[PDB]
């Protein structure tokens, strides 16, 4: 659920989730997907393709178990559905942390970013 | 979507609704989920679960008309679905406004996982 990914985002990039990936280039937000902007939107691209290849479980609403041992996130779910949507949530996670060197606030917005067509997931 | 939304909240409040509300409390804006911090925050999970009963429209993208008449919102949608959606904004503009006595802007960039989970819409 979006408790979990926040969550994990916090604890890897050390930035407020919704404040610094609720709405960065085309991909990370809530308005779909679009052409990459940054190594940072290109994270947020492969995570929501990420999700589509889930079976029935909902990435948003359901919750799961994961455990952070020496400052690492370690996918503890037994179920399948959960345990790749956990290790979606952790990549994206992980993902922007790999990049905050090259993050750029111009990328942010308020209402929608202007945005090419993202290949097909 | 988000543009109707922003500017009735800028008509109502009289604050950069980006900035004071963007990221407000556990509720308020992207992710915004969880256990509500105060009045303000309450109008947000409110206006969250009426953004859940839509039916056949995007809240986010979808947009819509409406006026402001002698300092009043005034939904003016034919279609069913948009006038019910301005009327979920309208309520939160009016809500925000209606609490801006214990608008707490500490609160502007509180950080969601640190929120409770919520009660069900
Ligand atoms: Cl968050
Ligand atoms: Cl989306
Ligand atoms: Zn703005
Ligand atoms: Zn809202
Ligand atoms: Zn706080």
Redesign the interface.
């Known amino acids: 659920s979006?408790?979990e990914?926040?969550?994990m985002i916090?604890q890897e990039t050390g930035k407020?989730?919704?404040?610094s990936y609720?709405?960065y280039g085309c991909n990370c937000?809530?308005?779909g997907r679009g052409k990459p902007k940054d190594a940072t939107d290109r994270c947020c691209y492969v995570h929501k393709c990420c999700y589509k290849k889930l079976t029935g479980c909902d990435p948003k609403k359901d919750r799961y178990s994961y455990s952070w041992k020496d400052k690492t996130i370690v996918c503890g779910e037994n179920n399948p559905c959960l345990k790749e949507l956990c290790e979606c949530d952790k990549a994206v996670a992980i993902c922007l942390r790999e990049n905050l060197g090259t993050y750029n606030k111009k990328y942010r917005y308020?209402?929608?970013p202007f945005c090419k067509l993202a290949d097909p997931c």
Chains 1, 2 share one sequence.
């Open positions: 979006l408790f990914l926040g969550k916090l407020n989730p919704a404040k609720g709405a937000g809530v308005l308020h209402l929608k």
